Design a protein around this ligand. Structure first.
Ligand SMILES: CSc1ccc2ncccc2c1NC(=O)N1CCC[C@H](C(N)=O)C1
Ligand SMILES: [Zn+2]
Length: 139
C-alpha cells in the first residue's frame, strides 16, 4: 500500500484504489496501473521532472529503503493476476530489488523528487509506474 500526495491530488495504484478514490476520480489508466483522485487537504510531496535512472525506493515487506538502477519507462508484458488479464503495462520501469505484492504503492525517489510507485515485481525484480510525465499534477 501507499500513495503520492501533491497539491489537491492523491496518486495510487489503480488496482488498490478505494470506493472514495473512484467517487473523487480525476484520471485513471488501466494500461499504467495508475489512478488519481482529488483531495480537500494540500498534499505533502514534490514530483521529479528529470531523466534519472538511479534512486531509492521504500520496500514495506522489509521496512527498509533500497537503492536501485532502473530502466527508462517502457511497455512491458505483465502476467495475468487477480486484478488484470495478461497485458502490456506502459510507462513501467524495472530494477533488480526485492518486492512482494503488498509492496505496491511504495515510493521511488531521486534527488529531484518523487519518480513513481511500486506496481509490479518478480523473482528479485521490482517494477515502478512512472509519474514524471504527468505535468498537470503540479498545477
Ligand atoms: C510488487 S507486485 C509483485 C511482486 C512480486 C511478485 N512475485 C511473483 C508474482 C507476482 C508478484 C507481484 N505482483 C505483480 O507483479 N502484480 C500483481 C498486482 C498487479 C500488478 C500489475 N501492475 O499488473 C502485477
Ligand atoms: Zn531525478
Amino acid at each position: 500500500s501507499g500513495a503520492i500526495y501533491v497539491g489537491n491530488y492523491r496518486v495510487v495504484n489503480r488496482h488498490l484504489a478505494t470506493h472514495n478514490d473512484w467517487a473523487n476520480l480525476v484520471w485513471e489508466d488501466s494500461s499504467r496501473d495508475l489512478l488519481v483522485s482529488s483531495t480537500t487537504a494540500q498534499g505533502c510531496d514534490t514530483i521529479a521532472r528529470c531523466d534519472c535512472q538511479t534512486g531509492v525506493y521504500y520496500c514495506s515487506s522489509r521496512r527498509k529503503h533500497y537503492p536501485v538502477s532502473f530502466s527508462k519507462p517502457s511497455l512491458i508484458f505483465v502476467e495475468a493476476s487477480e486484478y488484470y488479464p495478461a497485458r502490456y503495462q506502459s510507462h513501467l520501469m524495472l530494477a533488480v530489488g526485492h518486492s512482494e505484492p503488498g509492496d505496491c504503492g511504495g515510493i521511488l525517489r531521486c534527488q529531484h523528487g518523487v519518480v513513481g510507485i511500486v506496481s509490479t515485481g518478480g523473482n528479485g525484480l521490482v517494477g515502478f509506474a512512472d509519474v514524471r510525465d504527468l505535468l498537470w499534477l503540479d498545477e
